Symmetry: C3
C-alpha cells in the first residue's frame, strides 16, 4: 500500500479531487454511478466512525469523570477544573450564537428517500429527566441509549475515585484495576480512530464526490458557511474569553500569543492536542510558569477542556438540524450546551475524535444517526472535518495554556 | 446542601413527615397533587436502585461464588461455609413460616391502572430448568434475565478460582486480573448505593407520602404487620438456631449474647455488617476465639452469610405477592429459599443493599419490577426498609460470631 | 458422584451404550420415550456449549489477534506466524476437498418439525461487506452477530498491542490491564469447557441415543463417513504438507516422525495440545532444535495454529449443510476457509474447544444454531466429537513441531 503521505495532505487532496470528480460526473448526469460505486467507500468510512461511538462514550466519560471527581482534586485541581468547565461551556454557547446568526445548513434541506425528517414527540419533562437513569446499564449500553450511558459512566468514574480513597488496600487495588481496564479500552478505541483516519482520505473523497454529484454546488457554499461560523467562533473564543481573562489577571495577551505561537501552530497542523503537549509544556516553561503547576494542568487539559471541539460540536449540531429542516428548540439548545461540554471532555485529542463525539451530542438532542436524513447531514460535515479540526485543535491547546497561566498567577 | 445529619435519623424524619403530609393531603383530597409533584422524587429513588440491580447481581455473585469455591476452602473454610449456608437457608425458610402465619400484604391488594397483576403461565419444568442456562451471557445480562445471569456469574467465579490454582504464572495473573476488576465494579456499584442512600430520606418521604395519600391508613397497619413478622422471625432465628447450636457446642448462649452485645448493637445502629467487623472481631477476641480463625471467618461472614437479609427477603417477597394478590406456589417458595440465600450472599453489608438484592428474588420468582403492580408493592417496602435493615444487620453479624465460635470450638 | 474414570473412556462408553440403547428402543418403537426423557440431557449438553460460544469468540480472538499483531512479531515471529497461517489455510481447504469428494451428511436430510431448512437470501456483496463492521460492538456482542464480533475483537487485539508499544508508562499499563482481563475471561470460559466436558459422557449418551432412536441406523454409516473424510484429510495434511515442507528444508520426515512419536501420541490421547506442550518441547529438544527458538514457537502454536481443528471445522461444516440439504456455494466455501482459520486460532487446545468454535463458522456461513435443523445436525457431530478430536489434536501439535523445525533450520 505504501501509503506514506502526511494524512492532512492526503485528506485535502481527496477532498479537492472528490469535489471535482463529483461535480463533473453530476453535471454530465452520472450521480447514480457515484451513488452505487463511489459512495459505499464513504459509507464504510462513516460506519467505522459510528462503530467506535458507543465504546468511546462509555469509557472516555468514565475516565473523564474520574480525572474531574472531587475526591481527586487539590486546591489547584479545583481551580483549573472550574476554569476548564466554564470556558468549555462558554465556548459551546458562543458556538450556538455563531450558528444562529449564521444559518449553516439551511437551504440544503433534503429528504433522502422522499421522506422528510420528523422529530418524535418529546415525553413529559418528568419522564425525560427520569429516563436518563437506566434500569439496566448493560441494556442502555447494548442498544444506543446515549444519555443513560452518559449517566452511568459519569457515576462509575466518580465512584471509582472514592474507592481509590479507601483505607483498605484491596479495595483501592480492585478499583484501580477496573479503571485501568476501562482506560485502555478507551485508548484502544482511539487507536482504531487513528487507523480509520488512515482510510479517511478515501472516505472523504467518496463522501464529497457523492455530496457533489447530487445537491449540486450549493453544498460548497454551505460547507464554507459552516467553516466561517466555526472559525469566527474560534477567534471570538480567543479574543472575547482568553484575551479578556488574561488581561483581568495581569497578563498581556499579545506577548502571551507570541509565546504560545509554537504550541498554537503545532496544534493547528498536527491536529492533535496530545501530540502537541511536549511543545505546549515547553512553551509554558518558556513563559515562566512554575514546573509543579503546568506539569499537572497542561496534561489534564490535553484531554479535558477542548473549547474548540465544544464550539465545533455546537455549531455542527445546528447545521445538522438546519439541513434536516428541524428547529432546535430552547432546552434542546441547552441540552447541546451540556452534552457538547461532556462530548468535548470525552474527545481524545486525536485528529478524528471530535467528529465521533459529535454523534453523542446529535443522539442526545434527538437526531439519531440511524435516520437517513441525519446520517446524510452527518456525512456532509465529515467531508470537511479536517478543515475545522485544525483551528479546533489550536483553540483546545490555547485554552490549556491560558488557564495554566491564570491559575499559576493565583496559586 | 450541607446535609450532615445521621442518615438513619434523616430517613426516620422523612418517613414520619411523609406519613403525616400524605395523610392530611389525602384526607383533604389532594392525592393527585401528591401523585404529580411528590411521587416523582420517590420514582427517582427507586429508579436509582433498580439501576444498580443488574451490575450488582452479576459482580457480587462472581465474587461471592469465588470466596465459596471448593478450590479455595481449607478444612476450616469448608466448616464455616457449610454453617453459613445452612443458617442462611434455615433463615429464609423461617421467614416463609413467619410470612405465612402472618399474612402481610393481604388487604392492600390494588391494581394500579385498573388491571390486576396476572402471573404468566410457567413453562414445562424441563424448559424452566434448561432456561437457567443462557445461550448468550452478554444477552441475558443486557436484558434482565436474572436467573441466567445468576448461573453464569456463579460459574465464572468458580472457574476463576480453579485458574488461580494453576501451575502457570500468567494464567493465575490473568484470572486474578479479571476477578480484581469484577470485584471493584461490585465495590463501585455499592458506593453508588451509599450515594443513593444519601438521597433516601427524600425518596422515602415521597414514597410514603404517596402511599399515604392513596391507600388510606391501612398501609400503616400492614407495614407494621410486615415489621412484626420480620422481627419475630429474626428473634426466632436467634433463639431457635443460634442459641440451640451454641448450647449443642457447649457455649452458654446468655454469656455469648452479653459478649456480643457491643457488636450486635453497633450493627443494629450503623446498619452495616462491614462497618461493624472491627467491633465484631474485637468481640471475638474478647470471648477467647483464636486469632487465626476469627480473622478469617468473620471478614468472610461480613459479606457472605446474612441470615437476617435472607429472612427479610423471604418475608418481603411474600408481602409483594400478597399485595399483588397472587399465591406463591410451592416451588416458587423453594425458589425463594434458593434465590434469597443467593441474594443474601450477594448483598454487601451496606445499609441499602438488602432491598436492592431483594429485586433479584422478586425477578426470579416471576414478579418483574417493570410491572406496575410489582413496582408499587416494591416501593411500599422501601418506605420502611431502614426499620427492617437495623435488626436485619444485627442478625447478620450475630450469625458470624456464632459460627466463628462454633467452628473454633471444633477446629 | 465419585466420577473418576478417564473422560475419554467415559465418553466412549456413553457413546457405545447410547447407540445400543437408542437402536433397541427405536426398533421396539419407543423413540418418543427417548425424545421426552433421554434427549433433554443431551439438550442440556448442547446448551452449555452454545452458552460459551459468544464470550469465547470475542475474548479468544482479542487474545489471538494480539499474539499475531505485527506490533509484536520479531523476524522469527513473522516466520512462524506466516507458516502457521498458511498451514491452517491449506488445512481447511484440504478439508473442503475431502468433504467434497466424500459427501458426508447427504442422505441424513431431515426436517425436524416438518419444515425443511431454507437459507435466507444473501444481501448484495456491498452490504455483507459493510455489515461486518458493527455500529454498536456492545449490540453485536449482545445478540449473536458473530462476524461483527470477529471484526471488533480482531481490531481490539491489534490496537492493544500498539498501545503496548507506546512510550508512556500508564498507556502500556492500561492496555495491558485490559488485555490481562480479556485473557482470563477467555481462560475462565475454557475452564467451563473442562467442566461441561465432565458432563459430556452423559450428554453424548443422550445425543446418540436420540439420534439412534430416530434416523434409524444410517447415521452410524454417515457418522463413520465423516470420521473417514476427516482422518484421511488429517493424514493428507501430514503427508502432503508436513512431509513435503520438511523434505524441502532438508529434514528427513521419517526420522522426524520417529522423534515426534511421543508428543504425537500424547496429544492423540490427552486431546489437549496445551497439556502436551511439555512433551512437545522435550521432543523439540531431543531433535536438536535451539532452546531460544522452540521455547517461543511451540507455546505460541499450542493455542494458535490448529491445522487439524481447521480441517475438522471445514469438513464438519459441509456435513451440517449436506444434512440440512443446502449446497454450500462458492464464496460460502471461502468464507469457511477464512472463518475456520480464525476459529482454529480461537480454539484453546482443550478437548471440547474445537466443536464450540465450529459454531462460529456455522454462524458466519449462514447456518444459525437457533434453527432446529442446524441444531440437530450440530448435535449429530457432537456425538462423535471425541473420535475426531483425538486425531485433530495430534495434527495440531505435529504442525507446531514441523514449523518450529523449519524456522529453526532457517533462523
Ligand atoms: N483534534 C482535537 C480533538 C478533536 O476535536 O478531535 C485535538 O487534538 O484537540
Ligand atoms: N445492612 C445489611 C445488609 C443489607 O441487608 O442491606 C448488613 O450490613 O449486613
Ligand atoms: N483438542 C484440540 C483443540 C480442539 O479442536 O478442541 C487441541 O488440543 O489442539
Ligand atoms: Hg459533503
Ligand atoms: Hg409505602
Ligand atoms: Hg448423533
Ligand atoms: Na476531550
Ligand atoms: Na486541549
Ligand atoms: Na454478615
Ligand atoms: Na451478602
Ligand atoms: Na496446536
Ligand atoms: Na486455536
Amino acid at each position: 500500500k505504501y501509503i506514506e503521505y502526511p494524512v492532512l495532505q492526503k485528506i485535502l487532496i481527496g477532498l479537492i479531487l472528490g469535489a471535482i470528480v463529483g461535480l463533473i460526473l453530476g453535471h454530465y448526469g452520472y450521480a447514480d454511478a457515484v451513488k452505487t460505486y463511489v459512495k459505499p467507500f464513504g459509507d464504510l468510512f462513516v460506519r467505522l466512525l459510528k462503530m467506535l461511538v458507543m465504546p468511546i462514550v462509555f469509557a472516555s466519560l468514565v475516565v473523564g469523570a474520574a480525572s474531574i471527581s472531587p475526591a481527586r482534586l487539590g486546591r489547584v485541581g479545583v481551580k483549573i477544573v472550574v476554569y476548564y468547565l466554564l470556558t468549555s461551556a462558554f465556548a459551546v454557547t458562543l458556538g450556538i450564537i455563531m450558528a444562529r446568526l449564521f444559518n449553516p445548513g439551511a437551504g440544503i434541506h433534503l429528504a433522502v428517500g422522499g421522506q422528510q425528517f420528523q422529530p418524535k414527540q418529546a415525553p413529559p419533562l418528568v419522564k425525560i429527566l427520569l429516563d436518563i437513569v437506566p434500569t439496566n446499564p448493560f441494556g442502555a449500553l447494548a442498544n444506543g441509549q446515549v444519555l443513560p450511558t452518559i449517566f452511568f459512566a459519569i457515576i462509575l468514574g466518580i465512584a471509582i475515585t472514592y474507592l481509590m480513597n479507601s483505607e483498605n488496600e484491596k479495595v483501592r487495588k480492585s478499583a484501580e484495576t477496573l479503571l485501568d481496564a476501562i482506560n485502555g479500552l478507551a485508548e484502544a478505541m482511539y487507536k482504531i480512530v487513528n487507523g480509520v483516519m488512515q482510510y479517511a482520505p478515501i472516505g472523504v473523497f467518496a463522501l464529497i464526490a457523492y455530496c457533489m454529484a447530487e445537491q449540486g454546488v450549493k453544498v460548497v457554499g454551505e460547507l464554507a458557511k459552516v467553516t466561517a461560523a466555526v472559525y469566527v467562533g474560534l477567534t471570538l473564543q480567543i479574543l472575547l474569553v482568553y484575551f479578556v481573562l488574561l488581561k483581568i489577571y495581569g497578563i498581556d495577551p499579545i506577548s502571551f500569543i507570541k509565546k504560545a505561537k509554537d504550541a498554537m501552530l503545532t496544534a493547528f497542523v498536527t491536529r492533535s492536542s496530545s501530540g502537541t503537549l511536549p511543545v505546549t509544556m515547553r512553551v509554558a516553561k518558556e513563559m515562566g510558569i512554575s514546573e509543579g503547576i503546568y506539569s499537572f494542568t497542561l496534561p489534564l487539559g490535553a484531554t479535558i477542556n477542548m473549547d474548540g471541539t465544544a464550539l465545533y460540536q455546537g455549531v455542527s449540531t445546528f447545521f445538522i438540524a438546519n439541513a434536516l429542516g428541524s428547529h432546535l428548540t430552547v432546552g434542546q439548545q441547552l441540552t447541546i450546551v451540556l452534552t457538547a461540554v461532556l462530548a468535548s471532555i470525552g474527545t481524545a485529542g486525536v485528529p478524528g475524535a471530535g467528529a465521533i463525539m459529535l454523534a453523542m451530542v446529535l443522539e442526545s438532542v434527538g437526531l439519531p444517526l440511524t435516520d437517513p436524513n441525519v446520517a446524510a447531514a452527518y456525512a456532509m460535515i465529515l467531508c470537511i472535518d479536517a478543515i475545522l479540526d485544525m483551528g479546533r485543535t489550536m483553540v483546545n491547546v490555547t485554552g490549556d495554556l491560558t488557564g495554566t497561566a491564570i491559575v499559576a498567577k493565583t496559586e
